[PDB]
Design a protein around this ligand. Structure first.
Ligand SMILES: OC[C@H]1O[C@@H](O[C@H]2[C@H](O)[C@@H](O)[C@@H](O)O[C@@H]2CO)[C@H](O)[C@@H](O)[C@H]1O
Ligand SMILES: OC[C@H]1O[C@@H](O[C@H]2[C@H](O)[C@@H](O)[C@@H](O)O[C@@H]2CO)[C@H](O)[C@@H](O)[C@H]1O
Ligand code: CA
Ligand code: CA
Ligand code: CA
Ligand code: CA
Ligand code: CA
Ligand code: CA
Ligand code: CL
Lengths: 128, 128
């Protein structure tokens, strides 16, 4: 793993300490030949939770193009899920335009779909 | 005034129904040969409040370059102000990077400084 990245179970993680809109966070990870974090197990979810704390934080999961997709091609429907109860809900009520297309960890670790324009911290991941 | 714009006191106003980061909203208004709204009296403040309702909404006021400046050159210190109590405060505690450099109307119409990348509705203004 590069300097300032954390090794965990054959992956390297980088935890931002500033916010970006989802698309810009996604681009940032690509610059590092990485991708927004893809969570595939309870063990990994806990690890990530442990390092982000109770803070809204972008992950590599979205439905901007139709169905839910992980940024690295990992299959959504057969994959791990940790949504907050009553999420995802594609809420339009924020009034910012559109529903909600981008997933983030919430303050309790569980996932919510939110407006992709929102600035949140993010996590990059690469595999060893 | 152009179609879809509201005339008031020799100005034309356009009220968004979607959200943008401050710099994106600024670009949007400049595109229309307009500017993010510049509020210079109680009457203008009340007119804007009436149209936007209890919704966080960007205006043409910022301190990205140092001192508070209105986007059209209107002098800040000698001009109308309507800050919430204990604002502006250049808060860093949102943890998104930096302080708070962009002003918006809040739900009671009074102003707050906030993180420029937040998507809020906005208002454009042109003078007849
Ligand atoms: O109302 C739909 C939105 O809910 C927001 O989550 C709420 C949550 O439902 C509530 O129980 C409490 O925890 O406050 C949250 C507001 O921050 C979602 O964040 C939003 O995406 C919509 O789903
Ligand atoms: O603590 C500094 C931040 O306050 C935020 O305003 C809060 C306010 O403190 C709270 O009492 C309640 O009214 O909600 C407000 C907004 O959610 C400002 O938005 C932020 O810019 C900082 O100044
Ligand atoms: Ca992973
Ligand atoms: Ca959606
Ligand atoms: Ca949601
Ligand atoms: Ca004006
Ligand atoms: Ca500031
Ligand atoms: Ca503030
Ligand atoms: Cl936001």
């Amino acid at each position: 793993c590069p300097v300032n990245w954390v090794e965990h179970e054959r992956s390297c993680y980088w935890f931002s300490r500033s916010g970006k809109a989802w698309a810009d966070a996604d681009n940032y990870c690509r610059l590092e030949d990485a991708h927004l974090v893809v969570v595939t197990s309870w063990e990994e979810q806990k690890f990530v939770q442990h390092h982000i704390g109770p803070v809204n934080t972008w992950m590599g999961l979205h439905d901007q193009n139709g169905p839910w997709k992980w940024v690295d091609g990992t299959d959504y429907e057969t994959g791990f899920k940790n949504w907050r109860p009553e999420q995802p809900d594609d809420w339009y009520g924020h009034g910012l335009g559109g529903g909600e297309d981008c997933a983030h960890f919430t303050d309790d670790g569980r996932w919510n779909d939110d407006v992709c324009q929102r600035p949140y911290r993010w996590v990059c991941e690469t595999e060893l």
